[model samples]
Target chain A: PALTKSQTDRLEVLLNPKDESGKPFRELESELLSRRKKDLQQIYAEERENYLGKLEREITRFFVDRGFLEIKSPILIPLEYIERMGIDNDTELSKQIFRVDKNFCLRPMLAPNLYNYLRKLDRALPDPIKIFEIGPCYRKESDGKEHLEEFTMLNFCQMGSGCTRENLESIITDFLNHLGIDFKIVGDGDTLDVMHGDLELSSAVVGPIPLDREWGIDKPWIGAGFGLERLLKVKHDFKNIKRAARSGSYYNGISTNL
Target chain B: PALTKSQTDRLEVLLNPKDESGKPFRELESELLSRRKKDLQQIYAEERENYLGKLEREITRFFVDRGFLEIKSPILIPLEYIERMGIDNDTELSKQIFRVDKNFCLRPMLAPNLYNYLRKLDRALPDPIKIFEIGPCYRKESDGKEHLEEFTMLNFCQMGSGCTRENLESIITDFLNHLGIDFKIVGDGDTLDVMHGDLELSSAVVGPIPLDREWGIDKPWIGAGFGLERLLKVKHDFKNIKRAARSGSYYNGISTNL
Candidate 1:
């Protein structure tokens, strides 16, 4: 952490450059923004590694080329199924969940493991059990750089025949027009969120509702859930959603010793 | 669990069949395998939903078409990076790690979040930082059918220039020859594992050793990890690895009340 002599003369002119007829000019963006701050945190960690590999391959081929099914579940669940998703033990999302010992925890919402996989895939598959799940979610949150005690979600459900709310708004408007993102929809209290610029990346519902009859699932579904790091913090307007959260002091969302 | 009268005459000849000139001889597989044990656990939950939608698109297109970087870390880690990977208070992998309050836990190995993302991506990327993660990994595991107190892993690492150990055995032998699996590597006790018929799915090493200087990582690296429920219990010879785990009485590796 000891650079300055004008950051070691701008890291020796961005690592030995020279050509003003002086001969060695290597691809210079004016010595890459006068470099060194760990090379501008390696260009924000390779532009968050080409923006999380093109947003996880356009949200995993927008639900695996439309047939869905991608799953991975269990991030240590089972506090009686987070109190069967009613989140009890005195809520506030059950004290921002986390536990692991007094009978398991850690899965702070992926709709109680997609309503326990729609009650064992409602009479076993085919109807509309089109599943989906993208992982990592925890939330002892509350420190707020737009909070993240580990994030990334992307849920997705649909338990029996295009369960509606206008087919969850035409599959959230064809996945926000294939991630060209600019979103809106408000309603927020019992779900419908999706904002964007000020960030509630996603949330939707449409079910037999009373929390699917306390998880015995009485049919009618059509869920949603995003927060793929708040859609990479509103598609890179970042202002710290834990630097789009693959954070260990942010590598591909930048800030490595920033 | 009622159905016996010859399982209700094999579920009335697989749901109302009347053949022998009754003009409806349906294509039957012996009345769907004598029909009842909840219809043979709904045919092992739709043959584990067409084999986990064709094994999660061939292990997510085998490390995202070989450029890896499919990360999603943080399965609630930070118990001082699980005592800097020496797995805490008097090891034995710290009583099969699960905690979440003595300062967080639950990530019983993804090599301490891939050694905290190779120290913020070793000098910030471009040297073997070929990520890869695939989630859910907790283990208080013990009672077997091949232990799974929540499984799924997939790990993958490299971190800084063609990390060796024969380039992680030529990238785990081209990802087990693009998942046609059938492996065998052995050596155990401090490295190389792989095997198949006798379990041990994966585990490798190659590093600036001594556990990469207690995660401060000093150089040479390579990694491995795997377990996708022992690659779906050796790709379907599944005599229990919690039926290639995603269990709750298994669904896609079958056995839902079967």
Candidate 2:
């Protein structure tokens, strides 16, 4: 008989030579259990820090030193903010939301909160208000090694007189270059995305976007959001994003089956 | 007429010279609104990075470089783990827990998850297993400048032959000194608390603790857990922890009144 479906799936991930030492096991229960135990020992022996968490701190400091105030916005937000971001119950993005009740849901992106602050700091502080947030954003994304239902996103924006198309590209270019990832920029100020190879690392745009008017924001702005897990995936060559993120089944790219 | 309760309350917090330029307002609405705006602009003019997030990363990398591996565990944990940590449905600690459903609760402490890894890694890996987690732990300790319904906690442990009472205290002393907070350690291995001017920062215990028996852990261990906000409270002298933590009502130490 073939290996059980679960075993085959888990086996496929462990087959990455570093994970299980280029090892495989057959259908016998003892064989799978024996290998599982060794796989864990191998992980601990490596004695490396969790890469995702490490990357998070580095990126956070990176933005902070550049004059960006870090914002720790709430992960759970009201439906009104979602609607203001144009994700009402009828929208496709609305379907991705993890609703808590009639009025609140786990936020699917940092933009709604980011947008709120852009107007807030924009009005209260001086021109060129700069801020960012690195926190968990949730979506109902299912399957695919490249996606997570819950992921860390870094969103940043600066608005008012200092903002411009050159401003956005130059900052992002410095950021990606600092991360040492080769990338490409497609489209322009109003429509742009950062790519690593073929994978979309981020999508950014410059504004006084149409959405800004509804939020009472009239100033020009530049902002972008990136999934931190995807960056880890590309940088470290993870066999799957599960190994690159916070998951019950893995820690620091090591399967927890043992 | 006297100032309204809301204005007087906000005014009380801003009475700190750093918040509002030593400003105050009478009962007039325009006066309150005007000063509120000034308070925000003053906060921005200072151009300080958000201290809470900055402190978090500093504490994180401190652990990492010191040979302790970082663990980013789940914020929500299984109720079974809670019970095993000795908090049953009837326990006082359970009262502090936030129940998500019948089978899970927002983890009231990182100890439950940390202990699980202690045994798992202890068995699979070599001696002196050292690991730590810095994540949000939930509790219902409502009403206090020193408390938050949600707060960040850092828990770290090393279990194996090298573990001892001095091992725990020395490591903690180094951490506190690095943070530059004056602290006192009370009690020995079996019962340790980290304190700053009567405010408790952490409680620690060494084992083969009685709890270890149930969890199948046999080796010696030293572990401590700390409230990151409380430490910030002491380090920065924030009048309230709302200003020292992640809050919807405040960012950095400035209230979002305007």
Candidate 3:
């Protein structure tokens, strides 16, 4: 429906008024509703944008300065890829996948795709193949403060002689310390987890393991994946994960009046 | 079937020989085949990776420094979004979309999603809302030097008082000048195309037009979209677009040895 001339007048005034305080110039219900909806996520979006840029630059610069090549793998992967990663139709993991068709699905994690590249990169290049990818991954996650259906992920890995627990630990320590966040490293099963108190900031796994055999990658390697939003959450102690996510309801960590 | 000791030995030689020349120590038939496949894209991948990193940083830094909030919109959008863009099932554009299902698809372009954000951002904030997004967009494009099923795009828009032909031109000119690429702008059907010799590097469209009317965005604004690969192609004078794209066969603007 087309807005009436009167309505447009009200909207124009509401969008930008003479007064600087951002309070509605005139007490009109429609103007108030429009203003509330529009400004809700302003602060959160601005702050997160700044922080993400800083974090991305810091991490990428660290790797690039050290000769790591950053690569972006596809978000949509073939079904065979999930199968190679041990995710089959009967597996619980399959249920969480957002399938595109019989042949592909949105990648729930980055390892399989990264491994595919690593196999080719490892065989083609000399030892110490280092690469990283930062992007979004999806899952049919339940509503919770710790999980989101969509979230940003940073996955970095190194293959050959450079792949070791000490190397991985030093990289993680360097990054977390650069962010000025207090963290601890603890063993969880065969991998190590970087924890900020009780929240797990990231996890590292060193492998020459059975999974490596699937891709014919016999060389030992170390890879870790981290959730960007989770890092922000733990760092700021936000009560709701959505506050750190790409949402329309919050800005600069404040819930809008709407 | 798994490789025997003889085959494994040959594989090992093909991957990493005792010699620094990268030639197999003792040539086996299998080693030749494996070496060819493995080394084909190595140089291209390494070189392209470095260039891409530098390019991404340069473009993103320009926008961020200019106070444009960087956004990562969902790649999977509801079907209505494409419909809203006037790309219906009957249209050629719709056929090029990588549909996830009856209800959603990988976004072929960033405009619809950006418009969605702008509409909300417009009502919620002040005039002159500036935002930009850079990421992979998908399509079922034909095999051509100018086409890829997946490619990176940088779509930025400004809505409100500052949206003008001069503002849009200045932004595009400054970035392209920084890249040291020679380009010209000419009027296209309804938008301006940024051209380098014969190749179209990008397109810009300013609006208070019908498209904006469809989105209920009555305010005047300017939006421009660019293909990163195309920019690299025009800038470097690459013959094949794939050299600037993500591919298993090419890297760093060169076809791999494999």
lDDT (Cα, tens digit) per residue for candidate 3, span B1-258: 445688665443333322233444445545565645454345434432445555777888788777676776667777788888877778888789777757888888898868877776665665678888877788877778787777888999888898888889999999899888898999841479998888788889987677677777788889799888888777766667766776544444533333
Grade the docking of candidate 1: incorrect
Which candidate wins on lDDT? 2
Worst 10 residues of 2 chain A by lDDT: A16-25
| lDDT (Cα, 0-100) at B209 in candidate 2 | 73
True contacts kept of 2: 0.43
lDDT of each: 0.65, 0.75, 0.71
* Per-residue alpha-carbon lDDT of candidate 1 for residues A1-258, written as tens digits (9 for 90 to 100): 344467544334334222232323333434443443455344434433335435755686677567665565666777898777777768788788777777877777788777766677565455767777776678776678676877767887777777767778788888987887798877631357777666677878776778678878787777888877777776666565666776455544544442
Number of the top TM-score candidate: 2
Off by over 4 Å in 2: A1-11, A17-48, A99-104, A187-189, A256-258, B1-7, B17-48, B99-105, B187-189, B213-215, B256-258
lDDT over C-alpha atoms for residue B143 of model 3:
71
Clashing pairs in 2: none
- TM-scores (chain A) of the candidates: 0.35, 0.85, 0.76
lDDT string, candidate 1, B104-188, tens digits: 7677767777776667655645666677676667778667877787776777776677876777888898888777878987763
Q: Compare candidates 2 and 3 on TM-score and give the better one.
A: 2
Q: How accurate is candidate 1 locally (lDDT)?
A: 0.65
Model 2 chain B is weakest, by summed lDDT over 10 consecutive residues, at: B15-24
List the candidates ranked by TM-score, beginning with the highest.
2, 3, 1
lDDT digits (tens) for residues A19-60 of candidate 3: 233334344536556554544445424532644545666777
